Amino acid sequence: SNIPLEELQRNLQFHAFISYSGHDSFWVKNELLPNLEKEGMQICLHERNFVPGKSIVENIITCIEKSYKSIFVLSPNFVQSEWCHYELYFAHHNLFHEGSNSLILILLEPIPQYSIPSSYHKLKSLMARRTYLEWPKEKSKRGLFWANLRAAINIKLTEQ
């Protein structure tokens, strides 16, 4: 019931790469990863999988290149401690060709406008699309979130 990565055009190793902030580690390790790995998905994680002897940027790009999708756990913590790596890399490399299925945005916590610096142009461009999956506060809507998340991971990539 999951995408066979070996039957893809590229030699991908993971179904999705999860980029998150350390301050959001509890939800990622007790909700995100359990719900994805129990379904049989291979996850490139921000903590593990990173190879020693390389920079943090190289480890992130390596996880992205070996993953069918990339997941950003958007939150005030993610903006202040994680997004800068992507804002700097997007200024020179546009590997996510705009409107593409490659990037999946999870809004774990609402991001206030004041906490977003005026220099994070790509972050404002991504959140303006209103295509992110919001973590619901109601427990009854949790099952809808996971169904939407697994679908976003397993949907066919748009031609980019």
Strand-strand pairing, 103-107 and 67-74: parallel
Q: Alpha-carbon distance 44 to 70, whole Å?
A: 9
Q: Kindly give the interhelix angle for 56-65 and 83-90, rounded to the nearest 10 degrees.
A: 80
Fold classification of 5-154 (topology level): Rossmann fold (3.40.50)
Tally of helices (H runs) and strands (E runs) in the chain: 7, 5
Cα–Cα distance list, 108 to 18, 38, 93, 98, 104 (Å) = 13, 21, 26, 22, 12
How far is the C-alpha of 154 from the C-alpha of 101, rounded, in Å? 10
By C-alpha distance, which of 44, 48, 56 is closest to 16? 44
In units of Å, what resolution does this entry have? 2.5
Tokens of 19: 């980029």
Closest by CA position to 132, among listed 93, 106, 157, 95: 106
Q: How was this structure determined?
A: X-ray
